[PDB]
Amino acid sequence: SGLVPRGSMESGFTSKDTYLSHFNPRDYLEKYYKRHSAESQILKHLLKNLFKIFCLDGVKGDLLIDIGSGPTIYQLLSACESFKEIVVTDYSDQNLQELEKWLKAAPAAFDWSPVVTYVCDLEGNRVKGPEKEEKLRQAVKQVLKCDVTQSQPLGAVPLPPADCVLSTLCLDAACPDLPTYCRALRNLGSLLKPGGFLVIMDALKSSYYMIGEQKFSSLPLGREAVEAAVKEAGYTIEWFEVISQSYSSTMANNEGLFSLVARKL
């Protein structure tokens, strides 16, 4: 069936258990992070932006919790230069397994070398590709289970309050409505130190995203709804950027991406 995304017939939005069953890390990785495609340009945009946030701006500290990491590590590459400890998390178990293969530098794991090299050229080439992946691997401390829709996102796992909370291309997929988007930001706040940083980068006006022929739901947010929901979840925006570049017609109906850096009140 392709009339409605998988797991959305009864409710209207993809169910969380749909991510445990029909989400495949290998195809998600090959589809978006594997010539100079729409996806390659988007990745270059999120990387250049993460380089500005973590290396040019004042976003440094001890703990950075990454929420809904999937099987990806592109989003951590520049943060490992400013954060002493990273905690990668996700709801889908198979994604945490794909991340644990990467921490182990297993041969079965996905090859992030083109992305690592690109980030090294962004950072002025102080180090090479292999030295960079090793610094990130050491910085990743725990691999955790995650549910944004819970007052305690990481269950009973006792973690010190974080200096920053990163969340790339996840909240739109996780939150079925605006109240859930608001409640989920407040829950991420339960991990943040007072005045701690909230970093999000996600699609704009997208009702879906594809994994081959697997349609997955996305909350079609507008720039103003993002600004409004963030402010109302107990945060103050510092920086808000919107680029008009979209994913390929065949994989998503987004009308650009957004990226913000908010601070918890």
Ligand X SMILES: CCn1c(=N)n2c3c(cccc31)CCC2
Q: Tell the smallest beta-carbon distance from residue 70 to ligand SAH (Å).
A: 3
Site for ligand SAH in 118-177 (CB under 6 A): 146-149, 168-170, 173-174
Site for ligand SAH in 87-106 (CB under 6 A): 90-92, 95
Tell me whether residue 66 or residue 85 sits nearer to ligand X (CB atom). 66
Residue 148 annotated as lining a ligand binding site: yes
206 sits near ligand X (criterion: CB under 6 A): yes
E strands, the chain, where?
A: 61-66, 83-90, 140-145, 162-168, 192-203, 208-211, 214-217, 235-243, 257-264
Whether the Cβ atoms of residue 208 and residue 252 lie closer than 8 Å to each other: yes
Residue 90 annotated as lining a ligand binding site: yes
218 sits near ligand SAH (criterion: CB under 6 A): no
Residue 32 annotated as lining a ligand binding site: no
Residue 49 annotated as lining a ligand binding site: no
User: From ligand X, ligand SAH, none, which one binds at residue 187 (CB under 5 to 8 Å depending on kind)?
Assistant: none
Q: Tell the smallest beta-carbon distance from residue 32 to ligand X (Å).
A: 5
Which of 5, 68, 176, 189 forms a contact with ligand SAH (CB under 6 A)? 68
- Smallest Cα–Cα separation from 201: which of 59, 48, 90? 48
The SS3 of residue 27 is helix
Whether the Cβ atoms of residue 103 and residue 140 lie closer than 8 Å to each other: yes
Whether the Cβ atoms of residue 211 and residue 238 lie closer than 8 Å to each other: no
- Smallest Cα–Cα separation from 51: which of 86, 83, 75, 85? 75
Q: Tell the smallest beta-carbon distance from residue 252 to ligand X (Å).
A: 4
Task: Please state the φ and ψ torsions of residue 232, each to the nearest 5 degrees.
Answer: -75, -20
Site for ligand X in 245-264 (CB under 6 A): 247, 252, 254
For residue 58, with 0-12 CB atoms within 10 Å meaning exposed, 13-18 middle and 19 or more buried, which class applies? Answer: exposed
Residue 57 annotated as lining a ligand binding site: no
Catalog residues that contact ligand X under the rule CB under 6 A.
Answer: 32, 169, 172-173, 203, 206, 209, 218, 247, 252, 254
